[PDB]
RNA sequence: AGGGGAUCGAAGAUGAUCAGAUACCGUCGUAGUCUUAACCAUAAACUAUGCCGACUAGGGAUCGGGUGGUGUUUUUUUAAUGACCCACUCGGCACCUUACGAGAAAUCAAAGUCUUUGGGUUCUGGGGGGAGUAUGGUCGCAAGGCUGAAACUUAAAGGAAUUG
RNA sequence: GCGGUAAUUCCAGCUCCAAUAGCGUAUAUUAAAGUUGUUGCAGUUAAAAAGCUCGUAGUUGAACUUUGGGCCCGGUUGGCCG
């Protein structure tokens, strides 16, 4: 019930997405920057805006968010996505084959350096 | 109908399917027109020359459009071993 | 089909496309013809003669290794029974069921099956009289059936 | 109005099935249309389990239970909440929880 | 009303009419 | 499946299909040229013989018919025809 | 059990045409079936058909083009005069310039246009359009 | 301002797609009515029935007017639109937008001899909506349009002056009857003839080369 | 087979079936049974003649509340009694 | 009429065999697919790698024939394919959709997430059914990375592959990207294999 | 008209209820279930879906029968078999894809292949009542069954969803 | 369906319609009626599939028999022709 209205929710989302670099983590300067960047008709409403803004930034700092954050989120997504596991170890070095594994390539006519290794039962 | 003494008539001859040869209606919003390019000895999709296969909504909703496209491409030479006629 | 039932089962032989095959046996058609006449004199109905020949010797079909049919050659040679095999077996079934009804009149299922069997008997007799293999006025009777079955 | 595709029972190609009636009211229901349930019951319903364990001559037993076949009426099953009144869309749920 | 009891009532009426007609002729 | 070669089916497909359901119906049976040990008694037998046939020598039945194909004796030399 | 083999064959043709399939297998390939197929081929309505001659009755395998909307059989074969064929062609075909209702007459098997031109009538079998 | 947001709309802005026949050939789904009214300005809009419909709510009935209206140009193209609105004017406007979006071409043929301009339908056609089915068959030249008044008016807007109609079912349901007529018109365009058996191939359309100059 | 026979020699059966099923229509049944000629009190005539007997003040059926004030007429050709409505406003004193 | 340079090569064959895409669905299969040949006991359903590559090159040809990569759009909802569609969007235009596909995208010209794509690529129809029905509504072609047990309904080009394997799905997505880039002009060295490898198509848990 | 008539159980003998219980719910109990001479022929006798034929939507474990498998374990392992699995079936009982098919809709592998209307046949219906009521005719010992109206009356009766 | 004290419906005064010396009413019959259905109706729930089966009349009832080719000409065609 302490959760606020969807109108003020959208106001906070739009403010964050439009002036993310301007605002900072500190809550007091968050209020004193929101009051001058956004026209709000209620001091209580602007207080709730800034409170949810600092709450969402705290969640961002400790917790991942999908798309409602800044483009620096996309930047860090592309930096962490292209992060190789140290070296290309285990890559194809294990090629071992079997009966069916031979059979397919022999049927398709594309010979491969296969080695027949089935279960020794 | 077709008149000998000119008189260009029957405006907007409908576009006709290539899978089951049936007709494609005026507002059948499922009919697709696959536009696949031609490669000419250079590994390049040279612009301005493609071949078209029209697939109708009936074939789409039946779900054999895949096999129909394979057989059409193989008959046209676009594909080699997708579909064997002797099923 | 299944005239007197509700089943729709299909269980029939599949004669091959062969017309005169394999034509490998050195014993001519005289040998198979004597085989059938000897067995008919021995006293088997043509269905039994045919199945016994087929499973004993190598015969594609009596039709294709002779010039005529089994019943055709039996009729020409005079070994044909007084009544056809189908009617004979139908009458045998009818007399067996009739004796069962006499022993246990309370068997309504057997009474129903009896009516069903006599229906087939009468229809087949009508067909035979129409095609003139059997003489006219020949009728099936519960009395004369006991004489005809033996 | 055909409210049920199976006609509210389990009988296709069977003609007639001898019924066994309900134990609470015995209202007219054939055995296939019945709500026969495999009722499973513990001896103490996990209430005097410590007393059972302490007073058993041989401790740490498997402690089996009672299985019975309750033949339940449709009206009585609804009244005692054996069966739930479900919506038209999910009335076709064959697999029970 | 119930058609079963309508049928019962009409059967009783038919029986009464039959008895009356039998006694009258 | 909209376009299919009904002219010529594959051998595996025809074998999978029922014998009466093929393009031209053909029997699923064959001839078993069979022989008992000792004397030759060379006689070809139907696969679905339906009879307990035996050679004229003595009690040497070569078939014990079942619902479908007929069981053979212990030692029988048989060849497909 | 099997009253009109031509009707069964034409129903199979209609089912294949509505499904979109490009080929049909037809049992048991009567000669009137073959003549109907020949007329369809002459008018360019069915495509191709091949007669597999198994010894029992024969089978017809048909390579279809989607040019065919639906064919039908008119049972029984009504005994029709010239005005009667006029009525039938006014009743069974979408228009006057296209569509061919077919009838057996003394001059072989032909559609209504050819029957009119030869000035002879017969018994109506079916229609193609 | 107009500024439609759709590839069709932007192509019409550019003027690359210049023909209603061209849009109907590729059956590209239409999303606006300004495109239609600019492409075929010779259209006439007439309504026949606006009907009140009542939703009984825990206190009273909420009445919304359902409007069915057919609009098109007097040569070859008409469409129908159904919509329920609070006001008569709003219902008419919603019917107009829906019908202009649902405009369809008509295959007009000759009863025979192909002498002059088309006067009837090409092939006998059926259209079934709910229970009422309406079939149109080609009349000979001069007879007129034989139909119930609503279908008759639809045919006058259609422009074919000679047709016979046979109706079965509850034709007094005007909405279903008009929709059945619409499906019948669609089917009589969708029928097949040797004139359509004629040379089809129709190679690559300029759609790919005219798809490059769109905003997005 | 759509029920009804579809043979070239079934004209007799179709005619008989139509003849038997025609009796389900009220108009054909009444016309061929002559009920209007005998059972109807006008004798199968458009108009009849009679003698007024008395006045009837039968009431209307719901939802309505009025008196129609018809008359009782004994016909001349057959003598049957009927109740005849007096239509207009104040024709009772004329048809007393 | 092809110059016969697009045929299967030992390197790609070994890559496919290593990622085990030759194993498709379980013994249950869809009757519309002749891709499976001689599938052996134990459920092994062997997929035809040659047919897979032919479908792959056909799909590459279609998306190279489409002139506008911005108009080309890919759909994916499974976690095993979201990374793949983002890699595709990095490699070329192929404007993708991540996570759930919001209904009313290709239709509903007034919504903010409205796309109009000239063609749709889907990874798993069983999870991305909404996309194929919207494509059927807005009459656009669609390639589907179908399995041997997939609803091929409303699908133009069916890729014979496996949807239970992350390695297989990433490998086929990479070959899609590589083939389209090669046919477009990004990779002109036909003899030399490409810069990366499909080990990009993955996901580190930490 | 006989045999069991033990027990329950149309009819019939009690109370919180009553302005009324001769109704539900206590107990008891006649007629009443297997069977000689047999009748009766009705049921929501229902799949409210005639029968015989031909082609068609993820489709499996299946019920009876047949075929093939380094096929699985054993009996008497390596010399039959039975049971199981994996495939192909032929025949019979059931269903959820927003079905392209049909239907007014529930819904339907048939209720599809029917306005693009015709595979062969049998039976039944023509608004609701009166009324399954007949003066009649047949069967039955009876109860009753089959056949079966009309006069007159009525603007509705009804089916399938959808809003509380 | 209207009329129970603002009745556009009853009675009456101005206007309009079928028609013009012709219109209104009653009873039949035809189209309407694909509610008699051969064309061409319905039978799961709107009325309707006999409780089930057998069977005479009646209706209907695999396929095949000269399917096939060459030349000439009494006769047509807005005719590759004014």
Swiss-Prot record, chain C:
It is found in: Cytoplasm. GO terms for biological process: cytoplasmic translation; maturation of SSU-rRNA from tricistronic rRNA transcript (SSU-rRNA, 5.8S rRNA, LSU-rRNA). There is a cross-link at residues 38, 42 (Glycyl lysine isopeptide (Lys-Gly) (interchain with G-Cter in ubiquitin)). Gene3D superfamilies: 4.10.860.130, S15/NS1, RNA-binding. It comes from the Eukaryota. GO terms for molecular function: small ribosomal subunit rRNA binding; structural constituent of ribosome. Keywords: Cytoplasm, Isopeptide bond, Phosphoprotein, Ribonucleoprotein, Ribosomal protein, Ubl conjugation. InterPro entries: Ribosomal_uS15, Ribosomal_uS15_arc_euk, Ribosomal_uS15_N, uS15_NS1_RNA-bd_sf. GO terms for cellular component: 90S preribosome; cytoplasm; cytosol; cytosolic small ribosomal subunit; nucleolus. It holds the Pfam family Ribosomal_S13_N. Transmembrane segments: none annotated. Its main location: cytoplasm. The modification Phosphoserine is found at residue 31. Component of the small ribosomal subunit (SSU). Mature yeast ribosomes consist of a small (40S) and a large (60S) subunit. The 40S small subunit contains 1 molecule of ribosomal RNA (18S rRNA) and 33 different proteins (encoded by 57 genes). The large 60S subunit contains 3 rRNA molecules (25S, 5.8S and 5S rRNA) and 46 different proteins (encoded by 81 genes). HAMAP family: Ribosomal_uS15_A. Belongs to the universal ribosomal protein uS15 family. This is Small ribosomal subunit protein uS15. The gene is RPS13.
From Swiss-Prot, chain G:
The keyword Chloroplast does not apply. GO terms for cellular component: cytosol; cytosolic small ribosomal subunit. GO terms for biological process: cytoplasmic translation. Its main location: cytoplasm. It is found in: Cytoplasm. Component of the small ribosomal subunit (SSU). Mature yeast ribosomes consist of a small (40S) and a large (60S) subunit. The 40S small subunit contains 1 molecule of ribosomal RNA (18S rRNA) and 33 different proteins (encoded by 57 genes). The large 60S subunit contains 3 rRNA molecules (25S, 5.8S and 5S rRNA) and 46 different proteins (encoded by 81 genes). Component of the ribosome, a large ribonucleoprotein complex responsible for the synthesis of proteins in the cell. The small ribosomal subunit (SSU) binds messenger RNAs (mRNAs) and translates the encoded message by selecting cognate aminoacyl-transfer RNA (tRNA) molecules. The large subunit (LSU) contains the ribosomal catalytic site termed the peptidyl transferase center (PTC), which catalyzes the formation of peptide bonds, thereby polymerizing the amino acids delivered by tRNAs into a polypeptide chain. Belongs to the universal ribosomal protein uS8 family. This is Small ribosomal subunit protein uS8A. It comes from Saccharomyces cerevisiae (strain ATCC 204508 / S288c) (Baker's yeast).
Swiss-Prot record, chain H:
Keywords: Acetylation, Cytoplasm, Isopeptide bond, Methylation, Nucleus, Ribonucleoprotein, Ribosomal protein, Ribosome biogenesis, rRNA processing, Ubl conjugation. Coiled coil: none annotated. InterPro entries: Ribosomal_Su5_D2-typ_SF, Ribosomal_uS5, Ribosomal_uS5_C, Ribosomal_uS5_euk/arc, Ribosomal_uS5_N, Ribosomal_uS5_N_CS, Ribsml_uS5_D2-typ_fold_subgr. SUPFAM superfamilies: dsRNA-binding domain-like (SSF54768), Ribosomal protein S5 domain 2-like (SSF54211). One of its GO terms (molecular function) is small ribosomal subunit rRNA binding. Pfam families: Ribosomal_S5 (PF00333), Ribosomal_S5_C (PF03719). One of its GO terms (biological process) is ribosomal subunit export from nucleus. It comes from the Eukaryota. Its main location: cytoplasm. GO terms for cellular component: cytoplasm; cytosol; cytosolic small ribosomal subunit; nucleolus; nucleoplasm; small-subunit processome. Signal peptide: none annotated. N-terminally acetylated by acetyltransferase NatA. Residues 43-106 form the S5 DRBM domain. It is found in: Cytoplasm; Nucleus, Nucleolus. PANTHER family: 40S RIBOSOMAL PROTEIN S2, RIBOSOMAL S SUBUNIT. Belongs to the universal ribosomal protein uS5 family. This is Small ribosomal subunit protein uS5. The lineage of its organism: Eukaryota, Fungi, Dikarya, Ascomycota, Saccharomycotina.
UniProtKB/Swiss-Prot annotation, chain I:
One of its GO terms (biological process) is translation. It is found in: Cytoplasm. Component of the small ribosomal subunit (SSU). Mature yeast ribosomes consist of a small (40S) and a large (60S) subunit. The 40S small subunit contains 1 molecule of ribosomal RNA (18S rRNA) and 33 different proteins (encoded by 57 genes). The large 60S subunit contains 3 rRNA molecules (25S, 5.8S and 5S rRNA) and 46 different proteins (encoded by 81 genes). It comes from the Eukaryota. This is Small ribosomal subunit protein uS12A. Keywords: Cytoplasm, Hydroxylation, Isopeptide bond, Ribonucleoprotein, Ribosomal protein, Ubl conjugation. GO terms for cellular component: cytosol; cytosolic small ribosomal subunit; ribosome. It comes from Saccharomyces cerevisiae (strain ATCC 204508 / S288c). Hydroxylation at Pro-63 affects translation termination efficiency. The stereochemistry of the 3,4-dihydroxyproline has not yet been determined. Its main location: cytoplasm.
